[PDB]
Amino acid sequence: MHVVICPWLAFGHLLPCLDLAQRLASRGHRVSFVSTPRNISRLPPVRPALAPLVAFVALPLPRVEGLPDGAESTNDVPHDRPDMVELHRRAFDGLAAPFSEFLGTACADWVIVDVFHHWAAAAALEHKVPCAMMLLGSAHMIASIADMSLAERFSLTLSRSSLVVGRSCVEFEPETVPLLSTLRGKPITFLGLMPPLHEGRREDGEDATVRWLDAQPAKSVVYVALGSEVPLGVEKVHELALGLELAGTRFLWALRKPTGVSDADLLPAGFEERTRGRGVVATRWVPQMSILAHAAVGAFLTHCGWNSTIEGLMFGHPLIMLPIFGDQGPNARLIEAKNAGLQVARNDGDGSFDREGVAAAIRAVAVEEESSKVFQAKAKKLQEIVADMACHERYIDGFIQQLRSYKD
Ligand SMILES: C=C1C[C@@]23CC[C@H]4[C@@](C)(CCC[C@@]4(C)C(=O)O[C@@H]4O[C@H](CO)[C@@H](O)[C@H](O)[C@H]4O)[C@@H]2CC[C@]1(O)C3
């Protein structure tokens, strides 16, 4: 089959979509990976064996006054500037006509579109190409939802599609997957957990963060990362920093800067001087898969993005959970219910946290001998499911067969 994939302009979408593209190409299907040029230039390379079977289709973002050139993704357009978020949505919607022009002559068997691709789903109707909408999260998240604004963009994409695709399986969510049939009348299918393949990202194993981990004791380091886009304002950064310090563990923190904040204002006064001997802060993109694979990493302080949840558990790390938005709350509650992580205490109403809550969660998951042992054992039970690579390849096979059967 020729499958056209259209990920949302966000690295939590682009990365699993490029993994899915290569998995499809590995079974001898061909993929057109449709995105914008700077987003494509920042992606891991396709294996030489798959080069002619994964075609990158670069559609330039139209120019919009107030949106900087090269600001193509949620990693480049910060949530803490809602005016720029809106300009980026306008630019994204401007891809409609070029996408429809591409699709008409593409000889596509399927289009797989992301949650806000209402125009791509409209093009698939116009060109009589079956269209699957990606909702690459948990069955629990899809069940939550089942129970131009984002909700309206989502609703329109869904209505125009034929199929909804989740990223889970009955082994991981036995309570939910059998209960799901349709989402607003559309059949739901699960393509498995699709944990990333060994070195699919071709990260730098000589990265300064990994060389620091090489020097630390086994399972001694709390890795701290909040994915590629969620906002954390400078006051919240300071509470997270002081909580990490207070709990006393070794730490490696991949931190994105709030907009406007100088390196000098980013962290509490003296925090890096005091913690230099046990912790490292990196304000750049880090090789998260190399870090989570590392023997030095014990617990993962995560925002519970679905990629980070899967990546943490595929190496049996218990989670210290700080959900910020979207599916993160549902993801954190799902893992807490499996006893493999603990959420940081939040104020009910505004969802605030403080250094004491951060420190208390770190001590419970990573330090206290009895609780930490149970969290580790429960995370290892989940790793048996998440890291069953053969199980997840069978689900990819099953997904391809379901795409084939709709055509026939
Ligand atoms: C009523 C609602 C249900 C809701 C659940 C979460 C859901 C939606 C945002 C739809 C898309 C997927 C998902 C899981 C989500 O949070 O996606 C994320 O949205 C961000 C923008 O908010 C993007 O920048 C991210 O890249 C994307 O990963 C969805 C629709 C609007 C909402 O308010 C929230």
Ligand SMILES: O=c1ccn([C@@H]2O[C@H](COP(=O)(O)OP(=O)(O)O)[C@@H](O)[C@H]2O)c(=O)[nH]1
């Ligand atoms: O410094 C970073 C930050 C994030 N990631 C990767 O970016 C993705 C983040 O996706 P997730 O669903 O966890 O959160 P989002 O960014 O969508 O909020 C994951 O695959 C991470 O491995 C990374 O490699 N390095």
